[PDB]
DNA sequence: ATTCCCCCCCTTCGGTGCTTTGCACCGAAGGGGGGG
């Protein structure tokens, strides 16, 4: 056992320990229990104990992906649900192209992780079970748990601290030496010679054992290609474990979601995945057996993935001494591809960002969501925020943040010529255009049957009322504006009372997700010269007579 | 001091650490290293369930890092001289290198739990627990309270008119002497510190309202006048719009030059005095919180308004001065360094940013020892220039 | 038929706030992927 010293661990205060009682099992699965129960016991993992013991928990079997095989677990979610909360220090999820280029690189497993860690004395009679007593009549043969158990909400970040204690003195000891621990999987590489790097590391598996953790051969990988953390390690390069797409003629809904799932997997590595029109078949159905046909727009998207999806890619690793480029492409539909590098055609990382935050946005918008997403990612990875090559223009950037009422900002960056360009499709001008028709607009809906009118006077002799059906205030008034777009010439000026019109229009957006919305913009993009004004609601205003008694 | 205990019915500080630059966890790394020497912290396992952030800055362009835990969700789970504001210059002296030899209660250091993450994820984060009084806790200036007096007894008797007052780590001494005689003062304060171990409030001006003066009015003009008066009739009521709504009647164009007629020249004189005056009624209530808001009018200019209830402001300020972040992450410490002096408490923050793009990088520009609450508007408050 | 911890994306639903009792935004939970 591990002479390393136990975490104190209690309950939440006020509560006790589980109570469950073991639903029945089949006689195949008791056998297997019982062995591996005997197995554990004379081994000292667990502890046979009295009848001073009121707490149980249900014990199961699964078959461990191996038939023959039945590996034992036990329900720990009352207990769990009991026990006391813990800080995991697993803050995130090592990524190869942070590593660096190593002369010399191991993988090592240790075997039997969290049957090495001793429990705490006190918290032993909480985990308590009993085997299925036979058949049935003998009571089972009931054991506690000595070590930590699997299934437990506590055992990983004990077993955590409890590596971390034990590796810190030959850290220290070895201060040339990267050591990458995730759970029970360490990463270790060194620039020295292979006979030195191998030397050294028997004697950190001798210093582990010291500690009673022992790394089996079997999981002790010594040559290259490296499986660490599903990736393939190689000197120089890193790749993805391959991937396999299902390849069904009538997909379900668990179907497109487990193949949406593996495309996001594979957009760390592969460029240019879309999953926008796969992703919109899950909307709408929520059984998860229900046959959805394809669409025309997903087939094609899943043409693309698979042709993608067939030639070899490979990633690179970190050189501390050459500065990040993070280059960003637009795919359409507020879909944006982006590669991270370091030397051009050797990406370090690429991805994709494709969330829809807001109901009413731009390409400009998005963009920024973009960089900020980029720069967070990789502010984890390696430390240090990259040089950014966007499709915008710096002018068009200049006008954006200039005119726009929000603080944003973009860090160093420059600008890179390859289309489709991120730019605004029109611009609300700053002045009243002289010579053009005035258009006071006004929109009413009675709230109680949803019905109303929206409407429009202007500065020559016309005017039109239009009657809408199940319809709001913000609605009529959306729909004013868009009568007065919809009649007028190229230039025009637009006097309105409501202002949840005018901040939609002001945003200078290009989709939408209402669909009048969607109408407006597309008339203004037609436009030469558009003038948005705001008016007092009810003060007596020219679009206050003669455009609210009206519509 | 000992008892330190929490507001009854609740918990500590469950809260993430966020991503941090290499450069600055090398600057953790060394200084809680440091510090774990000399038994200020200790390290702890998992089973302390509570975490507040931890960051690095470079507070006074000094090159040498100073550590800032983020313990605003720790103060408010843990339960000011007037004359300072009347003063001519306000020196703002650090005395956060003085807690450390005060220790803390032994049953209140689990709060104070911390975490350094680590580049790639290498590592799991190292964790420390503070054993003496932190710097950025509410608890730390009332601690040590009783052991300031001591210090500042010899110092105020002498001089009479120094007005000092302490905040978290800041020492906020107030003079009426002139740009010299204060600093050697000063420097005799410090070295009065030693042996146990810049501001300008008379300058600053509220920021009124004005109206446009202009020869000839469109209907544009007169359009945007009246949303203005009619917007400041809640800030500052008798302002009254008739003479000038009977311009806007009738349909017409909105560069149509409206002359005005010789009665409604009264209105926009008469509410131009209105406009120009402190409106009084607006007395600090010392048990509400502050609430500042911030608003963007572009070409490097920042206007906001400190009040406790909506219409009615305690106080109206500009700060003026590529960088839109930095510019708003200056006037954040610039007004609460306002609020401290004239009132003693910081505001709670209507920041005018997407939240992903101020939690990225304003720990990059930020630079003083206390972290004020914030809350991130997303209505677009641009409709006319009210506050212009 | 039954476990545990961590990161991510995409969809759905309830809560919150301002105002225009509708609409926009946000966070948590469901599904999926990956690691141990």
């Not at chain 1, 390393?4 to 029945?24: A, F, N, R, S, Y």
């Not at chain 1, 040559?223 to 069904?248: A, N």
């Not at chain 1, 005018?502 to 957006?509: D, H, K, S, V």
């Not at chain 2, 007629?261 to 009624?281: D, F, M, Q, S």
């Amino acid at each position: 056992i591990s002479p390393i010293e136990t975490v104190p661990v209690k309950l939440k205060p006020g509560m006790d320990g589980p109570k469950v009682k073991q639903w029945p099992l089949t006689e195949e699965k008791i056998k297997a229990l019982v062995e591996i129960c005997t197995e554990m016991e004379k081994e000292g993992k667990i502890s046979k104990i009295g009848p001073e013991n009121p707490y149980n928990t249900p014990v199961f079997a699964i078959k461990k992906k191996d038939s023959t095989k039945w590996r034992k677990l036990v329900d720990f979610r009352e207990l769990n649900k009991r026990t006391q909360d813990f800080w995991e220090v697993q803050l995130g999820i090592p990524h190869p192209a942070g590593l660096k280029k190593k002369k010399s690189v191991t993988v090592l497993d240790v075997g039997d992780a969290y049957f090495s860690v001793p429990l705490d004395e006190d918290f032993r009679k909480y985990t308590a079970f009993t085997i299925p007593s036979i058949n049935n009549e003998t009571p089972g043969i009931r054991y506690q748990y000595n070590v930590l158990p699997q299934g437990w909400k506590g055992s990983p970040a004990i077993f955590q601290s409890s590596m971390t204690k034990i590796l810190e003195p030959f850290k220290k000891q070895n201060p040339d030496i990267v050591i990458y621990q995730y759970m029970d999987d360490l990463y270790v590489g060194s620039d020295l010679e292979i006979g030195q790097h191998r030397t050294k590391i028997e004697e950190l598996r001798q210093h582990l054992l010291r500690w009673g953790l022992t790394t089996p051969d079997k999981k002790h990988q010594k040559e290259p290609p490296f499986l660490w953390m599903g990736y393939e390690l190689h000197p120089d390069k890193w790749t993805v474990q391959p991937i396999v797409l299902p390849e069904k003629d009538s997909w379900t809904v668990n179907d497109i979601q487990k193949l949406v799932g593996k495309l996001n997997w594979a957009s760390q590595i592969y460029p240019g995945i879309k999953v926008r029109q796969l992703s919109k078949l899950l909307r709408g159905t929520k059984a998860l057996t229900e046959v959805i046909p394809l669409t025309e727009e997903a087939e094609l998207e899943l043409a693309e993935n698979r042709e993608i999806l067939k030639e070899p890619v490979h990633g690179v690793y970190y050189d501390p001494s050459k500065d990040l480029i993070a280059e960003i492409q637009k795919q359409g539909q507020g879909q944006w591809t982006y590669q991270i590098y370091q030397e051009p055609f050797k990406n370090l990382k690429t991805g994709k960002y494709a969330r829809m935050r807001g109901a009413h946005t731009n390409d400009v918008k998005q963009l920024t969501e973009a960089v900020q997403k980029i720069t967070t990612e990789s502010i984890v990875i390696w430390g240090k925020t990259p040089k950014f090559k966007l499709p915008i223009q710096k002018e068009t950037w200049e006008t954006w943040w200039t005119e726009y009422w929000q603080a944003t900002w973009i860090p160093e960056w420059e600008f890179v010529n390859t289309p489709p360009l991120v730019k605004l499709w029109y611009q609300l001008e700053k002045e009243p255009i002289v010579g053009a028709e005035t258009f006071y607009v006004d929109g009413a809906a009675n709230r109680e049957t949803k019905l109303g009118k929206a409407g429009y006077v202007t500065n020559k002799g016309r005017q039109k009322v239009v009657p809408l059906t199940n319809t709001t205030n913000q609605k009529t008034e959306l729909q004013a504006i868009y009568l007065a777009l919809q009649d007028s010439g190229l230039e025009v000026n637009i006097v309105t009372n409501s202002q949840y019109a005018l901040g939609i229009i002001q945003a200078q957006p290009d989709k939408s997700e209402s669909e009048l919305v969607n109408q407006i913009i597309e008339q203004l993009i037609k436009k030469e010269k558009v003038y948005l004004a705001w008016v007092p609601a009810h003060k007596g205003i020219g679009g206050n007579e003669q455009v609210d008694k009206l519509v | 001091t000992v008892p330190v205990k929490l507001k009854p019915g609740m918990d500590g500080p469950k809260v993430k650490q966020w991503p941090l630059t290499e450069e600055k966890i090398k600057a953790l790394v060394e200084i809680c290293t440091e510090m774990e020497k000399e038994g200020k912290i200790s390290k702890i396992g998992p089973e302390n369930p509570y975490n507040t952030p931890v960051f690095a800055i470079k507070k006074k362009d000094s090159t040498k890092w100073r550590k800032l835990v983020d313990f605003r969700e720790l103060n408010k789970r843990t339960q000011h001289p007037a004359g300072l504001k009347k003063k001519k210059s306000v020196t703002v002296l650090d005395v956060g290198d003085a807690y450390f030899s005060v220790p803390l209660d032994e049953d209140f250091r689990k709060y104070t739990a911390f975490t350094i993450p680590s580049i790639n994820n290498e590592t799991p984060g190292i964790r420390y627990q503070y054993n003496v009084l932190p710097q950025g806790w509410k608890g730390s200036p009332a601690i040590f309270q009783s052991s300031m007096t001591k210090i500042l007894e010899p110092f105020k008797k002498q001089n009479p008119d120094i007005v000092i007052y302490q905040y978290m780590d800041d020492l906020y001494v107030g003079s009426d002497l002139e740009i010299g005689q204060h600093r050697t003062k000063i420097e005799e304060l410090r070295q009065h510190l030693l042996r146990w171990g810049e501001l300008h409030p008379d300058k600053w001006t509220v920021q009124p309202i004005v109206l446009p003066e202009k020869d000839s009015w469109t209907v544009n003009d007169i359009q945007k006048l009246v949303g203005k008066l009619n917007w400041a009739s809640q800030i500052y009521p008798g302002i009254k719009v008739r003479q000038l709504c009977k311009l806007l009647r009738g349909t017409k164009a909105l560069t149509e030059v409206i002359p005005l007629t010789e009665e409604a020249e009264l209105e926009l004189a008469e509410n131009r005095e209105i406009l120009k005056e402190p409106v009084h009624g607006v007395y600090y209530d010392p048990s509400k919180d502050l609430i500042a808001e911030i608003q963007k009018q572009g070409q490097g200019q920042w206007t906001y308004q400190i009040y406790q209830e909506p219409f009615k402001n305690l106080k109206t300020g500009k700060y003026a001065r590529t960088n839109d972040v930095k510019q708003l992450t200056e006037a954040v410490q610039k007004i609460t360094t306002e609020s401290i002096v004239i009132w003693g408490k910081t505001p709670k923050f209507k920041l005018p940013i997407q939240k992903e793009t101020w939690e990225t990088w304003w720990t990059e520009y930020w630079q003083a020892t206390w972290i004020p609450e914030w809350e991130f508007v997303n209505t677009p408050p641009l409709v006319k220039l009210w506050y212009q």
